[PDB]
Design an enzyme around this catalytic site. Sequence first.
Site, mmCIF file in Angstrom:
data_model
loop_
_atom_site.group_PDB
_atom_site.id
_atom_site.type_symbol
_atom_site.label_atom_id
_atom_site.label_comp_id
_atom_site.label_asym_id
_atom_site.label_seq_id
_atom_site.Cartn_x
_atom_site.Cartn_y
_atom_site.Cartn_z
ATOM 1 N N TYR A 20 -74.221 21.878 95.502
ATOM 2 C CA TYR A 20 -75.173 22.588 94.792
ATOM 3 C C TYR A 20 -76.114 21.837 93.798
ATOM 4 C CZ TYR A 20 -72.001 26.108 96.422
ATOM 5 O OH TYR A 20 -71.197 26.871 97.627
ATOM 6 N N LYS A 38 -72.679 18.697 85.192
ATOM 7 C CA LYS A 38 -72.998 19.134 86.526
ATOM 8 C C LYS A 38 -74.386 19.766 86.331
ATOM 9 C CE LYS A 38 -71.299 21.106 90.636
ATOM 10 N NZ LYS A 38 -69.970 21.787 91.212
ATOM 11 N N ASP A 137 -66.570 22.222 96.338
ATOM 12 C CA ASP A 137 -67.204 20.776 96.025
ATOM 13 C C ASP A 137 -66.153 20.004 95.893
ATOM 14 O OD1 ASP A 137 -69.695 19.803 95.533
ATOM 15 O OD2 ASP A 137 -70.208 21.083 94.059
#
EC number: 2.7.11.1
Lengths: 295, 300
Positions: A20, A38, A137
């Site tokens: 993402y 992130k 992920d």
Amino acid sequence: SLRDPAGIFELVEVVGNGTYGQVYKGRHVKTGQLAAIKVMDVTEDEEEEIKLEINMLKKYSHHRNIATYYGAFIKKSPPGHDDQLWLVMEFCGAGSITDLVKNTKGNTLKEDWIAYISREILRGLAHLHIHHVIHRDIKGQNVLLTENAEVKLVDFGVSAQLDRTVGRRNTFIGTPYWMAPEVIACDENPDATYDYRSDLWSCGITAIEMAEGAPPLCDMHPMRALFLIPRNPPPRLKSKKWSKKFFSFIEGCLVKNYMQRPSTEQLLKHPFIRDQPNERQVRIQLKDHIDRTRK
Amino acid sequence: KSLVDIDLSSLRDPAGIFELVEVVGNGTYGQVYKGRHVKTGQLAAIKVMDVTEDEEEEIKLEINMLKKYSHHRNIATYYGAFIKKSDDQLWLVMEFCGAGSITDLVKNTKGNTLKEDWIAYISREILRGLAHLHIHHVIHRDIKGQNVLLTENAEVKLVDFGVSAQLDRTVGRRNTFIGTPYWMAPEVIACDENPDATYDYRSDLWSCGITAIEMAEGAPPLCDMHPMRALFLIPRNPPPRLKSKKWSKKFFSFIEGCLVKNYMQRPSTEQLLKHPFIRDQPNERQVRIQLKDHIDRTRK
């Protein structure tokens, strides 16, 4: 409400690129304390919904195999453009397992180190899965090591959850190599599922990444790899050097049909994961290897 | 106005050539920062990307793959590649276009729709820039509203950060990522009938058709569908088509030309420049005035 990170956190170096957004080694500006940050594009002006989704998941980050949640920040952009969300978590000092393998002679980890790291990834995933959270992920770049080889997952479901609720206009396919067959759309799978077992496939690919320094199909154009993952047989370790238990663990992770893939609790009982008589020695060796790599 | 210190064949330190005029505060993935050409004071767009010290050999290889082509009024001029040592930073530098993209133009219009004569004008400018690249054996590969920019003088220019060698799609393992699928032609998507997905000059013309739908409707077809599902459907679904009946038959006909699924049957750039929707623009002088006045109004 979510603040601009200027003067609070800064991005220092990239640690990873995933499903993402990107993960950076970040820094708390005024203390110099490190953090894993992130960075994810999000639909603009959805700060309230973002805070609601992060607040519902943050409790799950306290587990010893999950990087702890610190905070969240937003950077605004011109009208119509996605905002930039910074999800700030703990950084584990030794960095990612991908960087460790890149910095190891032969780009390969010892098998008993792989069993130890894989078990810790599975324990972090079991915590999320029992709480009905998918990670989505899992890859070497998203698994960090502390200086004494404690293992922690980066993100605790936030990227996966924001994708499915808040969304964004800047969507992309991403890198395909850790994707399970069900995550890739085809004739028999037109809608591409969200099932916890997809993380276990990714965990198998991550074990091959520790063994070989790269995931399967790494030397292929990503569009051809995306086409081949649902078609090809399950990936397998290339060398015959590995134990039959390691080949057997990969066979468990890499069952193509997710409905027949073992659960996280079943894989934690696999002999490769369950039987680690040299665990204390492995953690000492990893600590020593981390120290040597640093210098 | 030709810049005299540009060298598209070498990877140099940018000191004394280009400088950033803002902080790199949004990371190094999909971020273009405002810069300046030191000698002229001209503004520049600087794409900043993190690169490993070992990646420099791959960067030099790709630099050798750049094709030669002159400046063109419909291309934002590529000014070369630079390395800012520390992972180091790779800078890809281009002419600065200050009035936003075509996507911003349609997003900031009531109803998220442009007038048909604006679409014909903008589509012709995109096709003229593509004809310059195609005649020089260059495929753009990323035609979309976000990559078609406007200058303050209402000129339409394609983004070019070194499109002939795809310098911005490879470095820092970016070559292992698949981007957004919505403007992709069927031939660039791997499937049973197409196991070796390949770009052609005509792939850009499919993307031009999708960009015309983006100007008409505010978004490309399937824009909010999960991208993996859209990637599966593009080779299967019929050609996309404008949803409203309001548009002229010539506009529907132009979309049919761009969006022939089989690239071998898709018209060339030169053929699309002769399509009546593109070729016959009796109000082009007025459209340019309207675009300039819209840019002026947006600015203040």
